[PDB]
Amino acid sequence: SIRIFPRIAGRSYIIYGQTSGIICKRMEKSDNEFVIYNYISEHYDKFLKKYVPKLYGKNNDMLLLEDLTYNYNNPNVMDVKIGARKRKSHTSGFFSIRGYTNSHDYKFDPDEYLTSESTINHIKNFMEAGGENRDKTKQVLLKWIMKLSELANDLFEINLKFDGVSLIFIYDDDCSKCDVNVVDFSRVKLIDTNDQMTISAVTNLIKILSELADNP
Ligand SMILES: O=P(O)(O)O[C@@H]1[C@@H](O)[C@H](OP(=O)(O)O)[C@@H](OP(=O)(O)O)[C@H](O)[C@H]1OP(=O)(O)O
Numbered sequence: 001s002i003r004i005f006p007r008i009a010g011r012s013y014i015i016y017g018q019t020s021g022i023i024c025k026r027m028e029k030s031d032n033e034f035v036i037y038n039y040i041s042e043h044y045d046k047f048l049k050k051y052v053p054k055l056y057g058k059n060n061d062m063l064l065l066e067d068l069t070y071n072y073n074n075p076n077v078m079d080v081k082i083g084a085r086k087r088k089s090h091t092s093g094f095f096s097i098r099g100y101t102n103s104h105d106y107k108f109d110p111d112e113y114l115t116s117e118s119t120i121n122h123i124k125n126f127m128e129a130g131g132e133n134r135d136k137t138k139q140v141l142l143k144w145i146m147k148l149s150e151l152a153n154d155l156f157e158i159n160l161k162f163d164g165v166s167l168i169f170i171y172d173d174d175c176s177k178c179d180v181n182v183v184d185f186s187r188v189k190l191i192d193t194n195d196q197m198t199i200s201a202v203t204n205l206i207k208i209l210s211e212l213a214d215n216p
Pocket residue numbers: 009010011012028081084085086087088098164184
């Protein structure tokens with residue numbers, strides 16, 4: 001009847017679709033997430049097609065969303081909060097890693113405020129599952145940098161406050177496939193300008209991933 005989806009973070013009710021390639025996310029507090037998917041659809045559809053999982057439909061208070069892990073034999077997922085936290089500062093200055101596949105094995109704690117050294121160590125930990133082929137993990141890093149670059153650029157021209165949004169980084173164990181997409185629009189707001197805080201999260205991640213893709 002109901003199979004629970006293996007979340008990396010969040011407090012939200014998320015189940016598998018009755019059907020392949022679909023997850024059902026429940027809207028707990030308001031329909032704001034739906035209102036914002038539709039607004040972005042009308043005003044920024046290029047942003048929606050490039051960076052955001054497809055919304056196939058709504059069923060009462062459930063959003064039917066593209067399952068970003070679906071085309072992967074052995075997905076490694078990392079959730080990074082790049083939007084403002086409701087309250088509390090980011091655990092890594094410009095962003096907060098909310099969790100990652102096998103984070104329990106490295107004693108990762110989402111409440112622990114981290115140095116740059118710990119932050120980078122946690123991202124190296126997340127890449128461990130991708131194995132010792134060094135010239136193949138850096139292909140993963142570089143494809144991530146390519147899309148995060150275009151995202152940061154595109155964010156300059158979008159008049160939204162991306163409160164609460166996360167990046168979902170995914171890579172297959174064999175490193176043949178990867179992607180990153182923006183999720184969680186529940187707390188996003190219209191504003192008269194662009195979101196310098198959310199841009200500074202993306203550019204900082206670009207810096208960190210770039211240092212990883214270049215250290216020998
Ligand atoms: O709805 P809840 O259970 O109170 O928790 C949300 C929670 O969903 C969110 O974290 P994440 O789940 O997107 O990682 C928290 O985000 P912050 O990291 O920005 O604090 C929210 O703060 C929680 O909502 P609230 O602050 O209303 O409890």
